[PDB]
Design a protein around this nucleic acid. Sequence first.
RNA 1: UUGGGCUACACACGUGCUACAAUGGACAAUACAAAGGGCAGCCGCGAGGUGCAAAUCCCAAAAGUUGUUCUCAGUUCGGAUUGUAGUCUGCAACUCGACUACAUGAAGCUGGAAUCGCUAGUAAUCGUAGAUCAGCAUGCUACGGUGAAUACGU
Lengths: 82, 154, 57, 114
Amino acid sequence: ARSIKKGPFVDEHLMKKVEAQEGSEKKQVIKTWSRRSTIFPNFIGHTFAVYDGRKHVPVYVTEDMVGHKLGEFAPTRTFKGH
Amino acid sequence: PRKGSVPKRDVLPDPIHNSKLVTKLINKIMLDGKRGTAQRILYSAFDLVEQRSGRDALEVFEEAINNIMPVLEVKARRVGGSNYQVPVEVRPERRTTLGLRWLVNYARLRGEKTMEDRLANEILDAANNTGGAVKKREDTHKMAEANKAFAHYR
Amino acid sequence: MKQEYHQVIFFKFLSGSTKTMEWEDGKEYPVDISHPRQKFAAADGRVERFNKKFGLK
Amino acid sequence: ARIAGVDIPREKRVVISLTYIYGIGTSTAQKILEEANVSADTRVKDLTDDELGRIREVVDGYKVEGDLRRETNLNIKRLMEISSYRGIRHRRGLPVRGQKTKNNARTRKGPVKT
RNA sequence: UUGGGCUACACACGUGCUACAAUGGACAAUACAAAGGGCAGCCGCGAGGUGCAAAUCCCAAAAGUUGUUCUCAGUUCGGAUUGUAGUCUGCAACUCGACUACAUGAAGCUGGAAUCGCUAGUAAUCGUAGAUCAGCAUGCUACGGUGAAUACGU
Ligand SMILES: [Mg+2]
Ligand SMILES: [Mg+2]
């Protein structure tokens, strides 16, 4: 895990997108490539179209997802078989 | 090897019983070069022997080894479509090898918890003409005399 | 009943059983779990756990 | 005898016998017997009633047995409900900590199906 | 260039590591190496945090020995898997790093047909160092400690 002394990592460009919608009601999907950003408490209620390598898949954030990486909800490998 | 026989290595007599046979026994007991453990087992086993029998441990150990050492063995041979177990006489140096090897191998298969207990009981048993190592010698003679007709092969 | 089982004392209270102490009645009988307080606080929750871990109020 | 609802083995030393409780390992058992002043080498059939009572009170402060099983199961349930990467591996029966599955994942997968 | 993949997973094969325990496990005390590398490099239970450009300082022995305990139990063997909480590097450990602490405690009780290495300081076993390298070695290369059995013969 990331050192506590360094705090939780989020990409600055993604965080500004979340703060730009702060104080609104018609939230809009945030398209991002930042799979490595920690989900912060202010991400709750937001949708993130997260790149999985070929497409942006929607990730709607609930409270139980706080502290996880955005990439943990956009699977990158496809397997349904043998 | 094809060229010929190779010289063998001597060993020192053990510090307690002044016996080269005892040193060779420790080497058979020893695993992975751990000599101190092997020496500890051997000397503890000899204390058990000396008090469970009332005699000198070394004297019992020479009796036990004489009951394990075979005089005749069987050798494999291919004779034109029929494998023949030719009986041969064991040379004196190989007799000691088999005596020590069978004693340790059959002490390892016993049910006592510690090896010093297992080795001491094998020695006490073999000195009474019983036990696994004495049986293995008996089955070797029983395999040999069943083939003493084949002594004419080489 | 046809023709053991006595009144053993299991707090303390009289009872009958076979798995066989003076009482206010003045007689003696053969004598862990008090079952759960809140025991442990429930889970904090991810938001509170996040804020407390990094000191983010 | 019965400490946290479990009948710990009677013939063993307390430090060992306490580890038969779900939630207590070797290090926890050592600290429980330091807190509740009981010698580690006592056989639990030789524990006095007072010594046994002191152990049960210290053990009461630890999350063990069914309380610990509920907490662990709630954690796995949360991972599966939010459909995280780990939660998906939990439901699929696959390793969750990045281990390779081309070979040597038998513990999570079970016996081979040739 | 950003992100993903080279790390997938019903299986099959090769090479290894750790085990199945008492010649052992745990705990305490106490000895004995060789070969190499080094410049911005060499308080917390814990991982970790806050003199030397070299025969000079640092990296930095274990097996062993002596005692105590365990007592043949899938266990005080085994540490796979999983949960939680952390440390460090790195812009960044989700995919997909290493290590630590607590908890959990899988298969496994010497392995079919078959098959491999090794002739002496060798095999076996125990540690150590280096290259690559921000971080990552059960691999590779190298170093010492303990240290066998056997070779009748073609
Ligand atoms: Mg590859
Ligand atoms: Mg263990």
